[PDB]
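@channel anyone free to eyeball this complex?
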Amino acid sequence: GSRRYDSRTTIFSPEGRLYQVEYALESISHAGTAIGIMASDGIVLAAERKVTSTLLEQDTSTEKLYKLNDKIAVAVAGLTADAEILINTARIHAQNYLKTYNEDIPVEILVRRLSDIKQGYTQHGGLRPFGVSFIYAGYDDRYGYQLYTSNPSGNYTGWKAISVGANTSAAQTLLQMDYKDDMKVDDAIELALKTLSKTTDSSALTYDRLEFATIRKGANDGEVYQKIFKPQEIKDILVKTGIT
Amino acid sequence: TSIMAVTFKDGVILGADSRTTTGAYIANRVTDKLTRVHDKIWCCRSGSAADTQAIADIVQYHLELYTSQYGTPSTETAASVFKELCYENKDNLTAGIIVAGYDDKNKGEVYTIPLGGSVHKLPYAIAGSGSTFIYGYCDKNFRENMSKEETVDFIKHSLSQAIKWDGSSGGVIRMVVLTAAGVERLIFYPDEYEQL
Amino acid sequence: TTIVGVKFNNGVVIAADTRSTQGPIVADKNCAKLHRISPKIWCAGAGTAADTEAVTQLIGSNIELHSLYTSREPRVVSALQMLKQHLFKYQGHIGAYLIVAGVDPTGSHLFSIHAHGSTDVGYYLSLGSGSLAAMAVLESHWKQDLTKEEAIKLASDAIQAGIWNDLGSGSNVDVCVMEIGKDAEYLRNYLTPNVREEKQKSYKFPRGTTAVLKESIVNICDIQEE
Amino acid sequence: SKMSLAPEADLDSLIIRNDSLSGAVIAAIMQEAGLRAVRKNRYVILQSDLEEAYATQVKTDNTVDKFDFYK
Amino acid sequence: MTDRYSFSLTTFSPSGKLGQIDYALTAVKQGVTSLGIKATNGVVIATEKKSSSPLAMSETLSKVSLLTPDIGAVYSGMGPDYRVLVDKSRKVAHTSYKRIYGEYPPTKLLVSEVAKIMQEATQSGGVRPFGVSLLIAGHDEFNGFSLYQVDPSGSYFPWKATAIGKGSVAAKTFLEKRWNDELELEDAIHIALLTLKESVEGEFNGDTIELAIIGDENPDLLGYTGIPTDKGPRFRKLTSQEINDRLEAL
Amino acid sequence: GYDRHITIFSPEGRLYQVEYAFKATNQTNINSLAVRGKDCTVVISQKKVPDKLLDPTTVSYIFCISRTIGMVVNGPIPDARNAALRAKAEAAEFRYKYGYDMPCDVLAKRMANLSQIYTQRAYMRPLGVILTFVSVDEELGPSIYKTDPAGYYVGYKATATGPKQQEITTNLENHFKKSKIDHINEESWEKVVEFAITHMIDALGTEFSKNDLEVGVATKDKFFTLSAENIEERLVAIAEQ
Amino acid sequence: TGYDLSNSVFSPDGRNFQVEYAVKAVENGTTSIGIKCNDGVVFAVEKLITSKLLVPQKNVKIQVVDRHIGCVYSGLIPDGRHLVNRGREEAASFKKLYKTPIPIPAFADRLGQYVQAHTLYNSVRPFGVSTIFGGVDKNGAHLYMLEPSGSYWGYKGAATGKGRQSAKAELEKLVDHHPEGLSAREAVKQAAKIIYLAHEDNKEKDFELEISWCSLSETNGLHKFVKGDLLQEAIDFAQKEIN
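replying in thread with the prediction:
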């Protein structure tokens, strides 16, 4: 019957571990690198694509930066296919909360909601877990700027600066020596590019293989404007900060 | 509306009028009330225009499927499918239907299904609105096993009277002659049948 | 409302008035009343105006899909048989009255379909409040076999007569001619009976006539740049 | 060129059909067309024989033989 | 009688990579060559006919198809799996966007509804991935022309010109050097054929090379006149005579 | 192990289980030939009745789907009846919901899509019949579409199926190579049958009695199979030529 | 290797092993014949008497369906008694909807789909029974035999069970001598002769003969049991010749 062909993707191992969730972590270590830095007055999200040929039109392309409403953007690392599914369930839950309380969703709710969806598949169902890891950059008046990473376990914790994707270890050690608490949005940009410049597989770092988006409070009246940079602002900011 | 079917020596003959009213206003003076639900089993419709048209498309679908699997239906059989759509839904549909068929093993047969939902094998039937006014005229004049010339004249005199006294009937009298020959339509114009 | 459908030799011509009403008050002086189901199958709707709009769009999609799936041009009787079934399932709540006209590889057809799912054939048809005023004109001049210039005149006369003699109809006559083996011709505003005669005066007020309490500006553009 | 052929027969008809063939399969095809010419009793290899012999000793179908729905 | 498969048949092999999406990407590399080029005033997509036999007609088979009047598609991989995915592509375009907003979906939009169909062929239970890769060329009002590739994984990408199938390695090398920014739809047609001539060893009749443009609108195919607001279909598959013109233009 | 029982890909990249279905087809030793007339279609297939005990009438491979559509089946007969019964239901349902008769193409395309769902679900097994539909469609004229367990189908100028289908293909090709048209031309439907049987006697080598063949002919608006008397008339016409 | 464990899987050859196995389970049952006479059908089944405790003439293995379709089977006795039970729904249901007794070629079709369905999933076991069933409707007599695979055919005599070799060889000689179509009244005495001959490879445990017939002209096309004298005459007829 059906039992013969069954993988069983929800059992414990002989040592009290979940093999299948471990392996989801492994496939996230091949995908492109993504970094987020938290300054006093904004957040930088900066991600390196896995594609780079010139026939590909990377200019209009967005596969790393998504807006969830008008205050919370996420970056993706993992299966880009899988990630679009969780993003529409998040987009919808972010909006339901605005419908029922006429007040923009706290960052803490929208992150805790996505985590439990992922948790859900390893608890029951027998479906294979999700193969995605998010960095949430968002702004709320309660704590100011906030940064959160969640992985395919569903455990999320806040951060001051974090990185998922290739060489997670190497990227964290470069940031750790340089980061300071008095950073402004100008200072953070310069540390983000430089850290991707030291880890990239290819020695050259180009404007076309980088995606980049910030959230700054320099929008008037105590508000926040999310901009996902055009390819012509990235190009100018790579010559300004002296990476090329 | 005023329909009828008269079995005769070779098969069976159906006849109906072509009027469809919505109160005093006449919507259609030329409408076919004799529908083919198979190539040897026709039916005549009276009652609510919609209710019976819904039954006639659904019976046409049940009998096509019957043919592709089990072989040619009988007239008996076709009558029993109407029976199951009328009786089950008799709280929603108003359906007065005559089913008239020609087998090659039993000649012409007539089953009539009045508003209730029962079958009745009769040697000739009348139904509709204008039927009331000719029950007496037909019972005097119907002999069994008449010749095809005589039977067409017997159906025309009938509905002639049904048209003259009823206000819901009128226009052309169509006819379907349903025999071993096949399907032969006649039509009788208002000039012709108002003298006889 | 007045709607006529007149079959002739090589096609069918279907024409309507343009006045759309909301009780005694004319809602729109000029409005679309001929709906397109597919490139060859036009229909017109009387009765409740929200019901015909919604039903033609629903039978539009289901026949557009069906068209791409079989790779044939749609036959008129498809549009008739999907309407019949969908208007019955509701037991006659939906108050849609349509004249579905169209051409196809079988020939031209012209049907009428009422709110209960009852359907008929015809060579002339009418619908709406002033339907009886159109039927008198059809009966008077309709003869079997007409030419395209002739049939178009007969169709617009009937709507012409429905405008003067029924209150529900007014303004323009729209005609729509579909010939066998040709592109459908939608001839918009084909007869204009009467335009609004001038006013006696103008009424431009001098600036400063209204009294204004306060003023503000409402930023509609997205949150302004960084 | 060694063998006696009708000038009607033409090699250009053959070359397009198969997209793979080797110098030893070709050797066999000519033998077969010239062996079949003996049954008909024709001095020359007529284009009927050449065509028949082409379709035999080729095959090369094991992979899309009845599994053509991979395209 | 029952379905008792509810468990994924796609699991993570112990070194990442979902085993079944790797394999399916191999059946996409066995398929017949297919390629597309984007210009500043159109898009061309072209593919080669494969014939079961000389008995089989090939005109009856559609290997290029329409999704909407402005978006056409062409595939590489398995024939059966593309047929069912084109029909599920038209329903979901009509039901979650045509009825609800009127107009036909934008091209960005439509690719995402098709990518969710693919994705849920591994997340869900009992199934395996579609064995096809799509190219989707189309035209929307606020971004011009665009060209997309939707892979059996679900990932999509905008390209300027790409190819897939068995001659994909050779074809994309040639297109890398030949493509430019200024291009006509007439010039691109000449590049699309020239490449696909190297990849097809079989008969190169204009019967058996199916080419289709998403160029500009055809007042003639609209089917009705007298509405200056409506516009014709931008898609147009070329007949066999017209393709034989561009061959003698080589 | 569990990649070759169910329908998932193998590491190589091929649906083994589907591939195994095609070998299940040629397990009855029926051969068939099908040609397009000028206004009709003719399909002959051998009919071997093994034992004396079997009643020769019930054994049949030609199934009447509608007036418009005939269907000749190659393969094991349980799956025959299962695909013929599902075909009949779709033929009726089409008529009901769209109001005209189901064309040949549309019945062929509905079967390929059910066939696809059967190679994509895990618990379903693909049906091991190859279906060929003959008809005289009203829009496109004479037609033949041949469908298979994978879910691939295509049009045909003429076609054969069976164990010795290769021999029969060579003849059907040789004929369209000389005449240089897509279809046998002869107005009458009686002489397309005579031609048909000639090419089977060549391709199989077998001489046919009237019982060894079972003949089906689609004309305008009726599809019949010929009675055992009528197949004897045809074979006197081959002998007298 | 692993292709035999499960149903609805094919081997590289193209076979369903579970279905090939089920025919071996049919092969153990008792001998059962069916003779199509000119006017109807005669079913006859060897019923083994296992022990002196089993009650005589009380364990009928002939089940009727409607009023005119006899069913007799060999194989797994509970499993046959389920396939008929489902068959009493298909008949009673047709009769409700079309108000005519279900015709025999149509009943053969309903059963066929039902058995064919049970070779399509891993989740259900294939039926381990061969059926012989037939009767008389307005188009004449028919006889059918239903393999556990799901195929069925017309027949003029059928057999199943251990004695299928000797029986099918004897039904050939019965259609040789009587090519006109033997009489129904006579075929009772001929069916008896085919059970006693096929019971010489099984002559260890004596048996009790059951016969039933459905003829247009004898019983009005209604399926009955042969009982009383005509049955006690049949035993005599076959027993005198094979002495």
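from a first look: Chain C touches chain E at residues 36, 39-40, 57-58, 61, 64-65, 68-69, 71, 183-188 (CB under 8 Å).
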